[PDB]
Structures are given as structure tokens and as C-alpha cells.
Amino acid sequence: RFRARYRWRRKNGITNLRLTRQVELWVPKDAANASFYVNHYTFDLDDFIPAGTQLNSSPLPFKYYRIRKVKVEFQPRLPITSPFRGYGSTVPILDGAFVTPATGESDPIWDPYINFSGRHVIRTPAWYHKRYFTPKPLIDGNTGFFQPNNKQNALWFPNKQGQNIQWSGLGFAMQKGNEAYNYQVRFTLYVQFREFDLFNN
Amino acid sequence: RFRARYRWRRKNGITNLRLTRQVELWVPKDAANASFYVNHYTFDLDDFIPAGTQLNSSPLPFKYYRIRKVKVEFQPRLPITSPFRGYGSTVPILDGAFVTPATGESDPIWDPYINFSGRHVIRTPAWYHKRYFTPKPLIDGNTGFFQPNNKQNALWFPNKQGQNIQWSGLGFAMQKGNEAYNYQVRFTLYVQFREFDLFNN
Amino acid sequence: RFRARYRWRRKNGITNLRLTRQVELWVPKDAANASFYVNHYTFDLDDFIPAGTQLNSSPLPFKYYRIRKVKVEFQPRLPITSPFRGYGSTVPILDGAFVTPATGESDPIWDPYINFSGRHVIRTPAWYHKRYFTPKPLIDGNTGFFQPNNKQNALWFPNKQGQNIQWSGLGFAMQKGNEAYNYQVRFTLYVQFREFDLFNN
Amino acid sequence: RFRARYRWRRKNGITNLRLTRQVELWVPKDAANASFYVNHYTFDLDDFIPAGTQLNSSPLPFKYYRIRKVKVEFQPRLPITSPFRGYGSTVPILDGAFVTPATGESDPIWDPYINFSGRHVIRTPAWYHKRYFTPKPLIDGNTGFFQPNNKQNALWFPNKQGQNIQWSGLGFAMQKGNEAYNYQVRFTLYVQFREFDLFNN
Amino acid sequence: RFRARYRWRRKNGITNLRLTRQVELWVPKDAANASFYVNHYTFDLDDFIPAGTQLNSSPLPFKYYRIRKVKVEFQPRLPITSPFRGYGSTVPILDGAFVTPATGESDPIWDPYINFSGRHVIRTPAWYHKRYFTPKPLIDGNTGFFQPNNKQNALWFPNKQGQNIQWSGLGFAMQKGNEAYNYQVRFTLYVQFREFDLFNN
């Protein structure tokens, strides 16, 4: 009943791990327009796990994985006595189709994410912000299908260390002010692994 | 318990809509063979929704959708005092693989759908006919997989307005008589939409 | 009993949506008088919804609407180490008759909204402020009548996309200091729509 | 439950007041026909409230009002030993459409209000008479619509002091005798006010 | 409790009556396009009630009315052995804004009412069709407001016999075939009258 859940985890090698990395996010200057800096983030397992050996290719010796949750932290670098305050948006985007302008298109004067059903407000020179959600894997390029939220039926993927797929996350728009400012963005994956495979000589 | 279902629909922007279109179906003449007119129908969301603007590309401002049900109506154009009565078949075909003869192959003398497990009889100069079922999306060309019927686990698809996928429906065979006859075929989609996204300047 | 409420929403096409826009608010300088900046806001549906096509004139394909609630956010642009603090008032004004001085009349030395029954204090160089209330439509110019608060009996209006009416909201007075300061004002409409009408070719 | 009614009256500034004015009514002489004197009364708030100052335009510092009830008193000026007794009618007329003859049309020989569903008999040289009812505001000239009796849903109107609307009341017909007689007509409004607004320098 | 409802109907003169009229509807010919005949109906009380006398201007001696329900009947003139069958739509349109093409615009090739939330299918050479609903009065031209369905709070209107207002009803689209066909359209008003006023000499 609950020892049947124990023997499912023992037989199949089910483990639960937490992986974390950081990046830096630069919002440029804007003189007298208060435009929006629009970009996005996706999640690949290759950024969180380094390269292994010739014998054991992954430093995590598991054959399969699925991502349960992502936490995305926005950590500010500027104090609260900053001279300009801005109010932007963050959205989870599950199909990998963002509003991010390509090279040639300018930065918009209006918030492109303000009417979305899952937008939160990021107060964004000097305050903390975090989103927490289930990401979706980017499998098909033609149809772009994704599963509903269901922990028992979520698809498994091979951990291949270099050929890992993208997982679709977060779009954001940030108000630009008189001075360029900084964020340290921390990503935290909550991963469930399966099928322990350590090769030994 | 049931207000948790309300906050799931409010947070994610879940709406339920009904979309309808009509086409005309021509069955040609056959002299002294009583052959069968075999064709099929699939469903794309591009036929039901027109083109939008440059700003909002879809007239329905939702990011994702899944089709719950199709109703296909066969509406006759001829009265019941017609001189020849025919008896054909309709079948739901979920993988998109029909028995429809290509250009060069003739129309068969026998009903190709008469032994199928889900065939209904269409009495087909002058009577109404309708089918009601869950369609399946045409994702993979190599494997052709599709889900079982489960409303909670059915896959979500991006609404892309021009690049929309096919959904697999109905095959039919109609007995041809001494005179060519007409049907108006009405399709009705029952669509569930998700993630309201209206761009405003 | 509660599935009778479901069939009322399904038959009539009742949906509930949230629309948001932003503007910028400038309070000018005042030397050695501490006068008040008095202005007001009304709400039209044309500012929140862009223009549609020739076929479907509104990007929201609904025939009727009524506004349930407005949220008005005052988001500051200056930090809390600002050298002058001011204390003004916000009031909901339902008939559309404000105390705003016309071109030629000066800005008053006294708070014109300080004795109103529904005034809140806005601490107004560097703090957040929000009002939440039912707005009233501006129908008659001669009598200026409006309904009491009643969700079941509230009047319906056609969504006409360009000829939309005004809805009467908020008056405010802000204390002016030694330096001109900024607010980003965010408006959020909670709209109930009725009678889905999508034209398809 | 009943302290929720207290905080509704306190937050919105709900007060209930009684306003009274008097006029004189002259019925002229008629020799040997016993004709009827037909006239009517409507109610404007400008007759009951005098002019205010430049600062506070109304002597009642409230922004909105609605009239709950009118009492109309007919107070006689002649004693009961008067030589001729007459028997007329009073009617409430809610749309503002009376049978009162214009300049050029004579006074009728018959009672124009005798068959109305809400007529009372006024014994009318020397007796008291009173009517008590809900009046209706005269909003539209083209359609002339009015609400049913409902205290919770009755419309609110701005108190504008000079531009106030008419409220539709009473029609009456009085039998004329050998001598002209007098009435002092007293009107009493039962008004509910809302949104206290006193301007102070 | 229920004799209080009796004395409300007796004091105010409440009666309930049924008024009926007929018109003829012509759908023209169309060669080889199967276009749609789009028109609409509104309801005025002047068509249902003839002119009265100089003394009593209306043949119904009541001062006020409100329309509770309309029934609209489509009665066919052709038998069921007709050579072409068509399938159109009927919709209730409450604001008086129809899709009916003006003089100069042609008849559309597509059904303009097929996606509306309250459309019914009219099988339309030879079959009966009926709609039953609450109509809304056309009061304002600028705002076009209308009440929700509520029998206790529905607005009253003066019965003026010649200056009566429009009440907003039904839009319809009918498929045109090889031959022009006929319908007799029967309208039935369910009217509630108030304030009996018969003038007698």
C-alpha cells in the first residue's frame, strides 16, 4: 500500500535531486522612452550537469529523467535607494513560442505580456522575484504538443549528456530606465531520475 | 473541491467555445452499376477561424487549444419523394488512414466500410445523418500514435493561425444512383481554449 | 440548481476576462506653495482593446459586455529616500462630475477631496496606492442617473469597437513639492462578456 | 448582518432627510355649469432647496440623491358651513403625461380622472386630502420609461442645484362652484442622500 | 401573502393580454450560388393595435405596458415534396444591431449567424420554426443599454398609440434555392398592461 511505493522506487532506481545554476541578466539603458527589454529562458540539462568521463558519460549515473518543477529566482544587484523604479511582467510559456523580437526588430514601447493569464508583476530595479511551475519538454517542432499537469503520467526522457532536449519556461519584459541595471538569475531544477547505471571496470 | 476547479479555470484562462462551418458534398451519377462514392473529412482549425490582424494574429486571443468533440451533420437537399434510395456507411477513422481511392483507381462496387466496428448506416438520398465522437490529432507521420479517450490527459496544442494541424475524423461511402444528388455537410467543433493573450498598443 | 447556472452561461456565451493597460502620470513642480494637482480618470473599452479586421471588428468576438470591477494601481517611480513627502486624496466619482479645474483656473491650495465619504489617503512621492470599486456607465448627459450596486441587475451594453461609452471612475488630488515626480498608473478591468459572434468566410 | 448595513451607510454617507414647501391653489368661479378645474403637480428639488454659495453650491452637502416618497397635502381655507360642496379626483401619474388642457382648450364638463385605477375622491371646498406614493423621475422624453417599485434597485441622481430633474406626481380635477375657493397645498419629500462633500478653505 | 398579490393587481389595474399579427416573407431566387437572404424583425405596439377615437386614443384603455415575451412563428407555404432543401439560422438580437446588408451591399455566400450563441437551425423550404424569448426595448441610440432578464424589475413604458417604441427581436438568414418560396410569419406578443384609464362623456 505504501511499501508497494517503496518497492517501486527500489526496483526502478527512483531518486529525486535538486540542481542549481546562475546567470547574469543585463537590462540596457533607454533615454526618454521607457521601452521594454523582452527576452526568455529555456532549460537544458546540459547547463546544469558537466561532462563526465569516457566510461561514465554523465556525472549522474542514471539512464532516465523527468523534470518536476523549476524555480526561477530574480536576485537584484542594486539597493532600494535607486533613482528609477520599473514594473514589468514574467510569464510561463509552455510551447516555446515567445514574443521576443529578432535581430532587426526594435524593443516595444508597450508591455507584450501584460494581458496574459499567468503574468506576475516584477518590481524591477531592486526587488526579488520568483516563479515556480511545471515546465514542458520541447519535443515536436511541427505540432508543438504538450501534456497537462499530471505527475503519474508525465513522460520520461533519456539522459544523454550533450544531446539533451530543451524544456520550455519563462518569458519576461522589463522596463528600461535612465541607467543600465543588473540581475543574477538563479535556476533550480527539481529532477526525478530513474535506472541507476554505473559502469565499473 | 469545486472552487478549486474555478481557480484552475481562472488562473489558466480556460474557456469553452463552439465553432461551426458548412461545405457542399456532391455525389456523381452512376449508370447501371450502383457504385460507391468513397471520400473522407479531416478537421483543421484554419477553416473555422479567419485571419486576424498583424497585432493579434488570431481572432480568438488564446494561446493553446484542444478539441473535445466534433459533430458532423449530413443535411439533405432532396425531398423524400426521390426515385432512388441508397444505403451507405460512415466511420470514424482516428489515424488518418482512409480507403479513399487515389486518382487512377476507380470507385468500388462494394461497401469498403460495411464490416467496421464503428460504422453507422446513412440512408442517403434524402435523410439526416450525424456522427459525434472525439477526434485525434495527426502528429506523427512515421508512427501515427494517438491517445485513448481521457479528458484529463488529452494533449494541448498551440493555436498558430495558418500552421494549425489536422485532426482525424470521418470516412464515408455513399451509394450512387441514377441522378447526382447533394448534401450540405455541417461541422461543429467543441473546443477548449487556454491562456488568454490579447496584445494592446 | 448549480447546473442551471452552467446552462445559463453556456446558452448565452458568458465569459469573464481581465484587461489591463498602463499610462504615465506627471505631477509638476511647485515653488513655495504646496498646491494640489487635481485630475481624474474615466474608462473606455477602446483603450484596452485594439482595432480588429473588416470581417471581425473587435479582437474579442463578443456582442455585449458589462464592467464588474476596476482596479486602479498607482506605482511609484521614485525611491523612499526622496526629499519631500506629500499626502493627497483619491475618490471614486460615479456620475462623472469632477472638481478638476478647467484651462484658466489655477490649482487650489487646499485638498478638494478631503471631506468626501469615500476618500483614501495616497502617500505620494514613493508609495503604492490602489482603489477597487464598481464603475458606473455614463449614459445620460441630462439626468446622469446610475444604478445601485447589484450584480444580477446591472445593465448590458453593446461592444461596438470605436463607439464605446465612458465608465466613470476616479478623482485624485496630489500634493506638489520641490521636484516634479512620476507615477505609472495601471488600470485593470474585470469584464463579463456575452453572445459569442465570430464571423467566418 | 445588521452592522453590515451600518458600515454601508457610514462608508457611503447615507442620510435620510425630509423637505417641505407650500403653495397656494386657486379654483376659479363657474356660473351654472359645474365644470372641472384640471391641473397637475411635478416635483423638482430646486423648489425645496435654496441656492448655496460659490464654494458649496448646495445647502445640503451631498453629491447624490433619490426620492423615496412624496406626501401631498390639500389643506382647506374655507369652513365646513360653505354653501356648495364638490367632489373631484386625484391621481398619481408616473410618466408625466397629464390630461391638463392647454391654453385654448376649455375646462371639461366631466371628470377626466374618474375611471383611473388609482383615483381618490377629494371632497373639495372644505376638507383635508392627502396622497402618499413613490414618484418617478422624468428621464427620457422619447421613451418615457420608469422603474417598478423596488427600494434596493432605485436609480441615483446627481444633486446639481439648478439643473435638477423633474419627478412625476399628481394629477387632479376639482369641481367648480358658485364661488372661487382656496387650498394651501403642502408637499413633503422624503429624500435619501449619498456622498457627503463639504469643501473647506 | 398571495392576497397581497391580488390587491397589487387590483389597485394598479394589472391585466395580461395576448396580441397577434401576421406578415408574409419572400425569399427570392438564386441561380447557382446558394446565397443567404438576411433580414430582421423588430416589434412595435402600433402594428398590433389599431387607431382609436379622439376621446380614447387607444383601443386598449391602459396607460402603461411592458412586453413579457414574443413568439415568432415561421409557417411554410410549400409542401414537403419541394425539390430543394435549405438550412438557415435564426438569432435573437437584443441591442437592435443586425448584420443585414444595406442597399448596395450584396447577399453573402456564407451564413452570418452560424457561430452565434443563440442560433437555431431553420429547415427552410417547408417546415415550421418558432422562437420564444424576452425582447428588449430600444431606448438609447448612443449607449444601447438593456436590462438583464428579471420579471420584477423590468421597465414600464407609456402606451401612446402612434409614438410607441421599437422592441428588439430576431435576425435570420435563409438559404436561397432554384425557386422563390414563401413564409407566413406570425408574431405573438404577451403584454402586461397597467393603469386602466377609460374616458367617458
Place this chain on the structure above:
Amino acid sequence: RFRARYRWRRKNGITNLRLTRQVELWVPKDAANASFYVNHYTFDLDDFIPAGTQLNSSPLPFKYYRIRKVKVEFQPRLPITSPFRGYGSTVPILDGAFVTPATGESDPIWDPYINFSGRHVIRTPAWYHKRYFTPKPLIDGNTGFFQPNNKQNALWFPNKQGQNIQWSGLGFAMQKGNEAYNYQVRFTLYVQFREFDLFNN
């Protein structure tokens, strides 16, 4: 409740069948190293079902299938008085990614499957061995996703007779001794079929 399961199987044509085939497995000689013979097995439906006719292409007249279980039997050909005993491993591998050395890479000196979570020991000159598990279909080459074990939600596939997909099974490593030995490997599919389609002339 359980006759609803009967009408689901009757309407859709659900049948359950067992298909079996045999192959021969050769382990070569190794002099004085005791190396491992590493290979794998996948399952295609084309090996279990022969070719049909031009009319009915599959000898099983069903349109869809899904594989529930595989049994893989290792049947020995040598008696238990064999002079060398070996101890290898079998593993289920669900993504189709095996450790099998390509042409050019030698046979390893160590067991590559000894640390896997689902390995069983095959005592492997002269003893019986069997594995029993749910196989996974090889759909995507880029992502390699597969479902968790769930009988109600398992994907359906078209039975196409020649274009059938691979299903991912078993990897094994066998200890090589002084003499080459033999196994007869028996595979048993437990297949659930759907949508009976027999064409008749």
C-alpha cells in the same frame, strides 16, 4: 458498471491475442579471457505476423494495436553436465539505447549490465531464463520519450503490415567459455487489438 466495459469492448472491437516466435542465439568461443557476448533484442510486429493478401493486407483484420506485455524465454540446448558455467545479465532497456559494441569495438572483459537497477542473473550454459515486462514504442529519434506504466493511457498505433514500428526491449550480456553454446530464444507478445476491419468483395 461492468456491462459498460462490455459495450466498450463490443463497440470498438477490442480483442486480446497472443503471438509467439522463436530465434536461435549463438554465443561464440573465447580462449582464456572469459569475455562477454553483448547483444540486444527489439520487437517488431512484422516478425510475428506474415504478409496478407492484396485485399486484406494483414492476416489479423484489426486497424489498431498496442502491446501490453512481452515474455522473452531463454531455452537452453545443452545439458547440465556441461564443463563450464557462466553468469551473465539481462536488462530491460526502454529507450532503445544499448551498450552493444559496434563493428570494430571488441567484446568487453567486464559485465556492462551488472549495476543496472533491473538486472537479473542468467545462469547461462544450461538453464532456463525469462523476463516479463511492458515494452515501450520507439517513436521519436530526437527526444526518445516514453510513457510511464499505465494501462488506461497507453498509446494506440496503426497496424500497417510492413511499416510497423520497433518496440524496445531487452539487453543481455553472456559469459563466453571454452566451447560455443546455443540458446533458442522464444518471444511472446500479448497484444490488444482494436477496430475490426475485414474487406469483403
